[PDB]
Design a binder for this molecule. Structure first.
Ligand SMILES: [Mn+2]
Ligand SMILES: [Mn+2]
Lengths: 431, 434
RNA sequence: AAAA
């Protein structure tokens, strides 16, 4: 009988990886977790322990071992002496990656002593987050797990206690349905413009005049009356009106983008703004305005990454996708623009066409927190912005947080990366 | 004779500073075990933290630095210890093993337990509990609460976390007290009176419409008379926020507006002041610019700060050391951060981010920001409070939305909303100190 | 300071 002992902290991912790699070699699994004691400010990791048992399919081979106090050696040793299985194991393997420092020292030294009898082989190991290696005590076996252990997005979110997972594929992208028969032409025209280095020109026009016409009061594009009132206000600026700029200063590559939309979903009438039924207005403008206001950039980047990832053995749906959402039980949903899994490292990618320092900064804080919540503390966050290189470098330094590794866990791309964004993400993710 | 304290320098310097402050006076030597930098194994150095610890604990020549080449490798760790741990005769070796990787902990603990297993050398190990603020001993079985005994100031806290060029304002040096000299107290007391009268939600509604419709447009709208008068003529033709200002403004907001000096009033009597053609750009800016920026959000900063100041002094916190307004600092050659209010209870940093906004999306972004900031400057056990203008339901949603599990039952991200403004002083007091 |  051979037993593997895992220490259940609040990062289930390392225990999942070690367990996936070693489960075949063991007959019993002891998951050591914390009880909830509100009066010493101690939450339980039982919920993680259950998820580990569940996704590692341990079933009847799993023993759960609760510790009443994970900060007190005395009580830790007391609970171990009382509760640790007293069977005649021939090998006891403790992986001491998870948990508090005291849990580690005292579980380690408890087990080494309890099983000192040389009929029993004691082994300790540790999953190194920096170099993706399982290191054994005194053995220098040093096996890299970086490329060997895989996880899909459903398992990753599940062990971090997220549920109701939804995302989209290239074949299920929602705007492909909203723009029937025209999506490909639309996305081609946009991809052509970005590859021709017109992204900055595009975002400038989107900011002015596009957002000045089609973004104002809430439900502006849902009530024909409110929209015409907005049109007549802007016409008061005369030659300085956004409408005049729309009609007279729009570049040909933007007219071609606008004219790629289906006849009944175009913002223009000839080379002129369409000046207006509420449901007929919504059917004409709603999806088109929402797509042009930024969703297009989500699709563009996703289609640039897909190719590279297909060559790399990743499986769409399991290892990458677009428009990820999920929730903890009875809790609000998050939204992440693009996810990618390299081995067992989550890379969350957040996209904005903004060039403004303040807005991109806030999006940075957001993507850092989300990948931590859903993929754990060793996840990578990428922010793709419309900022110049100087601003992206500042933002990287501004939000950098130190965790002991030499590689950045928060990376910022900018307007000059848009044309070759697939290659830039390939380089950054697969290092 | 000689007694040595051993500390493991991870990337969270605060625990080590706290254990060191508590035990400094009882030890003759301090060994700071830190990591070396090696890009091949993706391993950064914690030397910068070790050096801040030596500095801010005033260790001087009693400090021995001990570098580890590889903090994931038991054999290299033991080798480095064998070669670099001081060889003098010690009567006591105390290892506090709170910091570092788990392999650092296990092998440093066991290396020292073995090396100093003599009958007359006292070996001790301790652990600082982040959850109940207890220094816990392995062999003596002591458990000593440090929550109220160990203190730290904002300058020391930010410095050990590698921040520098620290600035902030005092109650008596607050910036708007100069822009409304002779009138600040009257203005803020009128606002305070209304917010304490549960007019918060009404105030914010009015600020959104019509106040922000009239006074928030193009950049420098309120400093160019032509831009402002054009803007007003456009609004007048429309209904009009000018009509709503003149006809639908509640009495308590007239009382706030009328608390400003006459030359800083937005109103001309019981109507909106409209600049005449004789009004220069300077006249327009001098009348309106500071008043508008205050009413558009800055007032909230002063309001919340003023509601907690007496409570903090009553708890013997020292302004400037343990609390303050408009904190800014930076890492070397890096952009500055801005934090609306900071507070320090014992050694836990509380950062408070304020906004009058009631929109979910904006309040969520500010939530992410204060979470990250207090982590950067105060470490992993800091608390972030976000005070918004949202209703209770949106405030509760946002707390659960951004909640992150680190093993504690007390939340380290707290959100307050419009319903909390009238008693925000006691709300923060109960939240922070209980 | 519960994969530093
Ligand atoms: Mn986005
Ligand atoms: Mn604020």
């Amino acid at each position: 009988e051979k037993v593997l002992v895992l220490i259940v902290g609040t990062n289930p991912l390392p225990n999942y990886v070690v367990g996936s790699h070693l489960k075949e070699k063991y007959d019993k699994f002891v998951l050591i977790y914390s009880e909830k004691n509100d009066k010493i400010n101690q939450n339980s990791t039982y919920d993680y322990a259950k998820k580990l048992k569940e996704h590692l399919n341990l079933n009847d081979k799993c023993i759960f071992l609760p510790l009443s106090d994970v900060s007190n050696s005395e009580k830790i040793i007391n609970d171990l002496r009382e509760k640790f299985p007293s069977e005649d194991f021939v090998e006891v393997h403790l992986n001491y990656t998870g948990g508090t420092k005291t849990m580690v020292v005292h579980i380690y030294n408890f087990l080494k002593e309890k099983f000192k009898n040389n009929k029993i082989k004691f082994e300790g190991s540790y999953l190194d987050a920096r170099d993706y290696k399982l290191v054994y005590d005194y053995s220098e076996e040093a096996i890299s797990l970086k490329d060997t252990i895989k996880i899909d997005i459903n398992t990753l979110l599940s062990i971090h206690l997220y549920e109701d997972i939804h995302f989209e594929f290239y074949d299920t992208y929602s705007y492909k349905q909203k723009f029937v028969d025209s999506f490909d032409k639309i996305s081609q025209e946009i991809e052509k413009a970005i590859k021709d280095d017109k992204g900055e020109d595009f975002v400038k026009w989107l900011e002015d005049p596009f957002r000045k016409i089609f973004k104002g009061e809430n439900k502006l594009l849902e009530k024909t009356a409110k929209f015409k009132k907005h049109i007549e206000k802007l016409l008061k600026d005369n030659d300085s009106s956004p409408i005049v700029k729309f009609n007279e200063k729009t570049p040909q590559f933007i007219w071609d983008i606008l004219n790629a939309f289906p006849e009944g979903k175009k913002l223009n009438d000839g080379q002129k703004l369409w000046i207006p039924t509420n449901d007929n207005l919504s059917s004409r403008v709603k999806d088109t305005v929402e797509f042009l206001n930024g969703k297009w950039f989500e699709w563009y980047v996703y289609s640039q990454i897909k190719s590279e990832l297909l060559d790399r053995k990743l499986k769409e749906g399991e290892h990458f996708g677009i428009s990820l959402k999920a929730q903890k039980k009875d809790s609000p949903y998050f939204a992440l623009d693009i996810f990618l899994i390299n081995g067992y490292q989550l890379i969350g990618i957040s996209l904005t066409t903004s060039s403004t320092r303040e807005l991109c900064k806030l999006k940075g804080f957001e993507v850092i927190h989300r990948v931590r919540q859903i993929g754990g503390d060793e996840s990578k966050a990428i922010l793709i912005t419309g900022m110049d290189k100087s601003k992206t470098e500042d933002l990287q330094k501004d939000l950098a947080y130190e965790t002991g590794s030499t590689q950045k866990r928060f990376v910022v791309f900018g307007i000059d990366d848009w044309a070759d964004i697939g290659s830039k993400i390939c380089e950054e993710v697969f290092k």
